[PDB]
Design a protein around this motif. Structure first.
Motif, PDB file in Angstrom:
ATOM      1  N   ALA A  10       0.865  -1.193   0.000  1.00  0.00           N
ATOM      2  CA  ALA A  10       0.000   0.000   0.000  1.00  0.00           C
ATOM      3  C   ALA A  10       0.896   1.236   0.000  1.00  0.00           C
ATOM      4  CB  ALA A  10      -0.915  -0.018   1.194  1.00  0.00           C
ATOM      5  N   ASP A  11       0.314   2.364  -0.399  1.00  0.00           N
ATOM      6  CA  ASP A  11       0.985   3.678  -0.533  1.00  0.00           C
ATOM      7  C   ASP A  11       0.428   4.560   0.576  1.00  0.00           C
ATOM      8  OD1 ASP A  11       2.498   5.815  -1.472  1.00  0.00           O
ATOM      9  OD2 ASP A  11       1.578   5.863  -3.470  1.00  0.00           O
ATOM     10  N   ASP A  12       1.289   5.059   1.469  1.00  0.00           N
ATOM     11  CA  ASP A  12       0.905   6.047   2.511  1.00  0.00           C
ATOM     12  C   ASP A  12      -0.102   5.420   3.482  1.00  0.00           C
ATOM     13  OD1 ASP A  12       2.458   7.736   0.929  1.00  0.00           O
ATOM     14  OD2 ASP A  12       0.786   9.105   0.395  1.00  0.00           O
ATOM     15  N   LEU A  13      -0.112   4.096   3.633  1.00  0.00           N
ATOM     16  CA  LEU A  13      -1.036   3.444   4.591  1.00  0.00           C
ATOM     17  C   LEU A  13      -0.395   3.414   5.983  1.00  0.00           C
ATOM     18  CD1 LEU A  13      -3.818   2.234   4.815  1.00  0.00           C
ATOM     19  CD2 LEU A  13      -2.786  -0.024   4.495  1.00  0.00           C
ATOM     20  N   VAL A  50       9.178   8.226   3.193  1.00  0.00           N
ATOM     21  CA  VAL A  50       8.502   8.694   1.944  1.00  0.00           C
ATOM     22  C   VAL A  50       8.714   7.696   0.796  1.00  0.00           C
ATOM     23  CG1 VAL A  50      10.432  10.195   1.210  1.00  0.00           C
ATOM     24  CG2 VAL A  50       8.092  10.765   0.523  1.00  0.00           C
ATOM     25  N   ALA A  51       7.845   7.793  -0.228  1.00  0.00           N
ATOM     26  CA  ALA A  51       7.670   6.815  -1.296  1.00  0.00           C
ATOM     27  C   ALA A  51       8.984   6.291  -1.876  1.00  0.00           C
ATOM     28  CB  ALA A  51       6.810   7.477  -2.379  1.00  0.00           C
ATOM     29  N   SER A  52       9.560   7.051  -2.815  1.00  0.00           N
ATOM     30  CA  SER A  52      10.710   6.621  -3.597  1.00  0.00           C
ATOM     31  C   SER A  52      11.798   6.007  -2.709  1.00  0.00           C
ATOM     32  CB  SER A  52      11.231   7.772  -4.412  1.00  0.00           C
ATOM     33  OG  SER A  52      10.231   8.244  -5.303  1.00  0.00           O
ATOM     34  N   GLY A 106       1.795  -1.955 -11.011  1.00  0.00           N
ATOM     35  CA  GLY A 106       1.539  -0.607 -10.478  1.00  0.00           C
ATOM     36  C   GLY A 106       2.796   0.205 -10.239  1.00  0.00           C
ATOM     37  N   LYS A 107       2.800   0.954  -9.132  1.00  0.00           N
ATOM     38  CA  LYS A 107       3.627   2.169  -8.919  1.00  0.00           C
ATOM     39  C   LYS A 107       5.111   1.797  -8.808  1.00  0.00           C
ATOM     40  CE  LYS A 107       4.263   5.986  -5.671  1.00  0.00           C
ATOM     41  NZ  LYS A 107       3.863   6.631  -4.400  1.00  0.00           N
ATOM     42  N   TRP A 108       5.956   2.465  -9.597  1.00  0.00           N
ATOM     43  CA  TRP A 108       7.439   2.355  -9.556  1.00  0.00           C
ATOM     44  C   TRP A 108       8.024   3.459  -8.663  1.00  0.00           C
ATOM     45  CZ3 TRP A 108      10.477  -1.226  -9.499  1.00  0.00           C
ATOM     46  CH2 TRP A 108      11.821  -1.145  -9.879  1.00  0.00           C
ATOM     47  N   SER A 270       3.406  -1.292   3.741  1.00  0.00           N
ATOM     48  CA  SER A 270       3.116   0.107   3.327  1.00  0.00           C
ATOM     49  C   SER A 270       4.474   0.811   3.183  1.00  0.00           C
ATOM     50  CB  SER A 270       2.204   0.781   4.331  1.00  0.00           C
ATOM     51  OG  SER A 270       1.976   2.148   4.020  1.00  0.00           O
ATOM     52  N   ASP A 271       4.630   1.773   2.265  1.00  0.00           N
ATOM     53  CA  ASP A 271       5.964   2.343   1.908  1.00  0.00           C
ATOM     54  C   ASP A 271       6.387   3.445   2.894  1.00  0.00           C
ATOM     55  OD1 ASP A 271       4.103   4.214   0.888  1.00  0.00           O
ATOM     56  OD2 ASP A 271       5.286   4.637  -0.933  1.00  0.00           O
ATOM     57  N   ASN A 272       5.446   4.033   3.631  1.00  0.00           N
ATOM     58  CA  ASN A 272       5.765   5.087   4.625  1.00  0.00           C
ATOM     59  C   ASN A 272       4.542   5.303   5.516  1.00  0.00           C
ATOM     60  OD1 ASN A 272       5.818   6.914   1.650  1.00  0.00           O
ATOM     61  ND2 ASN A 272       4.180   7.221   3.140  1.00  0.00           N
ATOM     62  N   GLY A 273       4.648   6.219   6.475  1.00  0.00           N
ATOM     63  CA  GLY A 273       3.567   6.483   7.441  1.00  0.00           C
ATOM     64  C   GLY A 273       2.353   7.105   6.776  1.00  0.00           C
ATOM     65  N   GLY A 287       3.876  11.658  11.113  1.00  0.00           N
ATOM     66  CA  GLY A 287       3.488  10.778  10.005  1.00  0.00           C
ATOM     67  C   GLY A 287       4.387  10.989   8.816  1.00  0.00           C
ATOM     68  N   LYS A 288       3.856  10.743   7.624  1.00  0.00           N
ATOM     69  CA  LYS A 288       4.639  10.775   6.363  1.00  0.00           C
ATOM     70  C   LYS A 288       5.591  11.981   6.349  1.00  0.00           C
ATOM     71  CE  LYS A 288       4.084  10.676   1.318  1.00  0.00           C
ATOM     72  NZ  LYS A 288       3.098  10.681   0.215  1.00  0.00           N
ATOM     73  N   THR A 289       6.842  11.746   5.944  1.00  0.00           N
ATOM     74  CA  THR A 289       7.940  12.746   5.769  1.00  0.00           C
ATOM     75  C   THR A 289       8.665  13.021   7.092  1.00  0.00           C
ATOM     76  OG1 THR A 289       6.797  14.858   6.132  1.00  0.00           O
ATOM     77  CG2 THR A 289       6.662  13.932   3.900  1.00  0.00           C
TER      78      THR A 289
END
Ligand code: CA
Ligand code: CA
Ligand code: CL
Ligand code: CL
Ligand code: CL
Ligand code: NA
Ligand code: NA
Ligand code: NA
Ligand code: NA
Lengths: 439, 439
Positions: A10-13, A50-52, A106-108, A270-273, A287-289
């Motif tokens: 998941a992304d940002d979950l 964060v994502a990348s 999906g997302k790269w 999940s890739d980040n908070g 959270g995220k970042t």
């Protein structure tokens, strides 16, 4: 004999979103069922906030700080950074060398040059590249036609992206049943801007109202075009998460109907908070970042029937660096030349004890330029040292007594502060940690 | 005896926009009249390719590179940079010390911390702070109530910002007629998102159609929410520029009605080049955020009846650094301690010859992170060397034979290349030029 590996990210979950993680508002029955069939980790970490950067840790199994991608890849014009296929034996490639058919749905977010795309999933060796982004995702588009995904040329009227993504996972499973396979299922959900099918939104609106009183759903969320507030429960996030849950169910079904569930490993991550004013990180700070627990602590459920004891809870620190050596042990391979910064978890997954090796994060925010979030961190046991660079300072938390990081110990425990600072500084030199972007 | 100084700066107004600068679409009669009453410069430069850095050059009279603000100040959370009143004797303060009443109407963009605002125009000494931004301007709001300008608490229904700004300039003039005054009129126009009164938009739509044919205005601009295309003439930009022109007229009127036009200096300038797919930079290369001529070359008209010969054209290079020492000579003051990187233009304004001193730019894009635009540049005479850092390389143009910078001479004229590289490198050390933000 070699197990199938299905990595569902998941992304940002946020840490606080899943039923199995304490959430009484969201409905995640299938993920709860996966939790009761597997091992749930309470201190699993993304190697970055964060994502990348987190996604690079997975595919490389190297510290984001070492790779030189510690923040999200922005649009092409705003970056000279990308993941170079000539610099890393990626996870998909290592499993290919172990006899696996590899696939990404999906997302790269590991190359944002869509003109050339020299760092795209195909350039990295994936045998199947299904529904990856064809331009900068930004706020995204979860409804067909999918404006960030050209290679989804065909689809049903008003088709919802998470539903398409999981249908492609099932198909991928069915098509490649005869041989070992690695499926990297990279969800675009639950990334802002928040969007879900009408019936699912309605359901959680009605469930919101039943709890905060009639009309309160409308009240806190037409006024709300981005569907965001300071209120913990988010009917859009809920509705998006339900769509993910059903998808995980459909994958679980397909494995039985094709008789693979026995020797197929399932990971949910999940890739980040969770993102602020959107995601639930429970009692965790920020959270995220942020390198505070809320930005890096992730749901993690590993299922492997027979090999992993069902309905187990594991409290030992783990991180996204650990997937690469863990999948390579599961597939009977050795780290061929490429150095690895994580650890094989098979021993821990099978009941074994943890070594308590220190864990590291570096966030100089090269892309967000978030000066107050610019920091580095080390965790050893229950102690976590964060070093901040804007308003220079050291913060020490005991995550056992203080999981919300509300009580800074640095001045009250100087010997432990000094000891974690040493490990952190030595690490920063080892990985050639990029200086933060300040005056 | 000490002349009034009125400094009128447009935002993102390109070299190719004014009637006096060759534009046959836009209507700037009052600015054309100011041009016929003054000296028009064809090679006047902003000391930087973007808002905050150019505005710092004016108030400090120091190279943006030296100040350490070479790119726009983003939102508070994305920066530790601001202009510190304890670090610089600002232009307003130097004119105060010369017996002037000082005033600013509009955009600061030299502090984005609106919580404390320790670097705001008031903290910098302005006796009057009228309609300055109270939060991050971003895409702005040109219609009352003005969502980025809290201190404009009162105004007429649907009041247009440029019209309010110029009404405040007239009032400021009337109120302070008895004494010398410095008015810094900092327009929010013509910054995106493009917005103008209905009648003015219609006028230039009708004028667009009369030229590109019936329905073509609608065609290239409801579809267009941001009112932008690759077509040179922009009816929104035109309509915004007309609003500025009328405002300049109203200031010119007020000076006569109050009998100040004789000993009041008027400057019209722009803080950086026109924005792509919006502004007209004529035949100049690129625009805002580039050190190519299109990002740094600005309209400049200086009017001082009797002292400056009317309807003169000046081809000598000048920059935004020059205003500080020029206004201080005009006001009978000496540079009190603070060092200055510009030159007094009074000699040049009065008919005198130019010294041909080299001019410098540094854009490491600390905020935009535009890797392909990251560069440093020197101009001496007609020769301009740009040094690029992503895809490292040197580019040499003869701006006399090649004002569009279409023919790179660097390899064809190596002695001149080497000579300008020396001046540029020596300068970069002198000002401690910030390294660009790359891998
Ligand atoms: Ca993410
Ligand atoms: Ca500007
Ligand atoms: Cl670019
Ligand atoms: Cl930097
Ligand atoms: Cl912040
Ligand atoms: Na590779
Ligand atoms: Na769509
Ligand atoms: Na000052
Ligand atoms: Na408004």
């Amino acid at each position: 004999r070699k197990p199938n590996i299905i990595f569902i990210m998941a992304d940002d979950l946020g840490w606080g979103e899943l039923g199995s993680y304490g959430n009484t508002f969201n409905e995640t029955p299938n993920l709860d069922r996966l939790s009761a069939q597997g091992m749930r980790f309470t201190q699993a970490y993304a190697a970055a906030p964060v994502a990348s950067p987190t996604r690079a840790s997975i595919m490389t199994g190297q510290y984001p700080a070492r790779v030189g991608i510690t923040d999200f890849l922005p649009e092409d014009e705003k970056t000279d950074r990308w993941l170079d296929p000539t610099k890393y034996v990626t996870l998909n490639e290592a499993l290919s060398a172990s006899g696996y058919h590899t696939g990404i749905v999906g997302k790269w977010h590991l190359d944002t040059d869509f003109k050339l795309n020299k760092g795209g999933p195909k350039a990295h060796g994936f045998n199947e590249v299904i529904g990856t982004e064809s331009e900068y995702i930004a706020d995204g588009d979860y409804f067909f036609p999918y404006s960030k995904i050209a290679s989804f040329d065909k689809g049903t009227a008003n088709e919802y992206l998470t539903d398409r993504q999981c249908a492609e996972a099932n198909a991928f499973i069915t098509r490649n049943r005869e041989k070992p396979f690695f499926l990297y299922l990279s969800l675009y959900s639950v990334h802002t801007r928040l969007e879900a099918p009408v019936q699912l939104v309605e359901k959680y609106k009605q469930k919101f109202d039943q709890k905060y009183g009639t009309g309160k759903a409308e009240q806190f969320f037409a006024n709300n075009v981005r569907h965001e507030s300071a209120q913990r429960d988010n009917p859009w996030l809920a509705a998006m998460l339900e769509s993910i849950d059903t998808g995980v169910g459909g994958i679980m079904k397909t494995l039985r109907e094709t008789g693979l569930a026995e020797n197929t490993i399932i990971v949910f991550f999940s890739d980040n908070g969770g993102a602020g004013k959107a995601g639930n990180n429970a009692h965790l700070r920020a959270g995220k970042t942020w390198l505070y627990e809320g930005g890096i602590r992730e749901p993690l459920i590993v299922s492997w029937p027979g090999k992993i004891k069902g309905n187990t809870v594991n409290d030992n620190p783990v991180t996204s660096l650990d997937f690469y050596p863990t999948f390579l042990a599961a597939a009977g391979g050795k780290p061929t030349g490429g150095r690895l910064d994580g650890h094989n978890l098979m021993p821990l997954l099978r009941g074994g004890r943890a070594s308590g090796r220190p864990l590291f994060w570096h966030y100089p925010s090269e892309t967000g330029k978030w000066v107050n979030r610019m920091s580095s961190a080390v965790r050893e046991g229950n102690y976590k040292l964060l070093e901040f660079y804007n308003n220079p300072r050291l913060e020490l938390y005991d995550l056992q007594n203080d999981p919300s990081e509300s009580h800074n110990l640095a001045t009250d425990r100087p010997a432990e502060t000094a000891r974690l600072k040493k490990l952190l500084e030595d690490w920063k030199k080892e990985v050639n940690a990029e200086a933060p972007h300040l005056a």
